[PDB]
Amino acid sequence: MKLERVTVKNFRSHSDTVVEFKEGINLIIGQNGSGKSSLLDAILVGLYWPLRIKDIKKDEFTKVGARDTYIDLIFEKDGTKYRITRRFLKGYSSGEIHAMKRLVGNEWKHVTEPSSKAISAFMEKLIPYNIFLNAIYIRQGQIDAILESDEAREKVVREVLNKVKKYKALAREAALSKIGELASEIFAEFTEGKYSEVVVRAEENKVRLFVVWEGKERPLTFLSGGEGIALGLAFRLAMSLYLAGEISLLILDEPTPYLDEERRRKLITIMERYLKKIPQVILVSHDEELKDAADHVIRISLENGSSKVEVVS
């Protein structure tokens, strides 16, 4: 799964926004209110309409009147280039137009009936909603929530991962354990071998998380800020791996809304050494200092009342 281009017109501060994504780490920088957040929303909606994206109302697309709303998304998956186009007609004309095409030579050919129903059905076979929304897309607050406490950790796990009672209990225990193994490997990678085990223990509306240092279970209080963001990211990505079985695309939506020299220096190290192994990463941040660790930099800002895109690299 690799995004190529998103076009968004007449959605929030986007009058006519085109963003082109490439290989490697794509940093989308912008101030609060720039439109960088709504851009991601428009991607998710373009992919999975009419399924729920966050708290966004259908009416915001079908109703908020005058001027057509338009979302066009080109992406590649398994050697095929696809294009999803959604048009919400307004200002005289009315209704909805949906199409999904694949590129055949130079021609875009419909891959299913141009209806939202058929396109939804196809997208569930290509890349299911729950996988994209929980494995590929990492929502703001999740990484911090993992590091907050045992209860909040429990909440993030419950969110991301969603005779019979026995089955359910077993499934949950197994899930937590597998995530622990995966996170051990990743976090081990991230701290150059300092730690090589991450312990995860479910315990009554709680996910206990412990670091392994000197073969003793240490609480996350033992960690500096850096190795903190490392552990939270490693745990979050372990959950993505658990769900999807691989990470080919990763969308990090404001992973560090607050960041210090240390946290930032660590995220930078992690981008440079580790996240560059992922075919594409899209990182949305307010932090200019991340630019150095990125392959491609796109600044989004509000100018003359609409989002404007500046390609920095």
What's the CATH code of the domain at 91?
3.40.50.300
Nearest to 3 by CA among 71, 88, 56, 61: 71
State the method: X-ray
Rg, C-alpha atoms of the chain: 21
- Encoded tokens for 62: 């079908």
Half-sphere exposure of 180 (CA within 13 A, CB side): 18
Collect contacts of 195-204 with beta carbons under 8 A, ≥24 apart. Answer: 195/227, 198/231, 198/234, 198/235, 200/176, 201/176, 202/154, 202/172, 202/173, 202/176, 203/150
Binding residues: 12, 32-38, 60-64, 140, 194-195, 222-227
Please give the angle made by the CA atoms of 262, 282 and 243, to the nearest 5 degrees. 95
Which amino acid appears at position 230 of this protein?
Answer: A
Q: What are phi and psi of 192, to 5 degrees?
A: 55, 20
Which amino acid appears at position 117 of this protein?
Answer: K
Q: Which domain holds residue 243?
A: 1-313
DSSP string, 111-167: SS-SSHHHHHHHHHHHS-HHHIIIIIEE-TTHHHHHHH-HHHHHHHHHHHH--HHHH
Beta strands in the chain (DSSP E): 2-9, 17-20, 24-29, 69-77, 80-89, 95-104, 107-110, 137-138, 198-202, 207-213, 216-218, 249-253, 280-285, 296-303, 306-311
DSSP three-state, residue 99: strand
Taking CA atoms, 261 is separated from 35, 47, 191, 221, 226, in Å, by 26, 36, 17, 19, 9
31: DSSP letter: -
> What b/e readout covers 239-250, taking b as 16+ CB neighbours within 10 angstroms?
bbbbbbeebebb
Are 171 and 158 in contact, with CB atoms under 8 Å apart? Answer: no
Are 46 and 86 in contact, with CB atoms under 8 Å apart? Answer: yes
- Encoded tokens for 83: 């294009």
Nearest to 183 by CA among 134, 125, 241, 142: 241
User: 258: Cβ–Cβ under 8 A, 6 or more apart, which residues?
Assistant: none
Q: What are phi and psi of 286, to 5 degrees?
A: -95, -5
Binding residues for ATP: 12, 32-38, 60-64, 140, 194-195, 222-227
Please tell me the total count of domains within the chain.
Answer: 1
Q: Write the burial class of residue 125 (CB in 10 Å: 0-12 exposed, 13-18 middle, 19+ buried).
A: exposed
Q: What are phi and psi of 182, to 5 degrees?
A: -55, -50
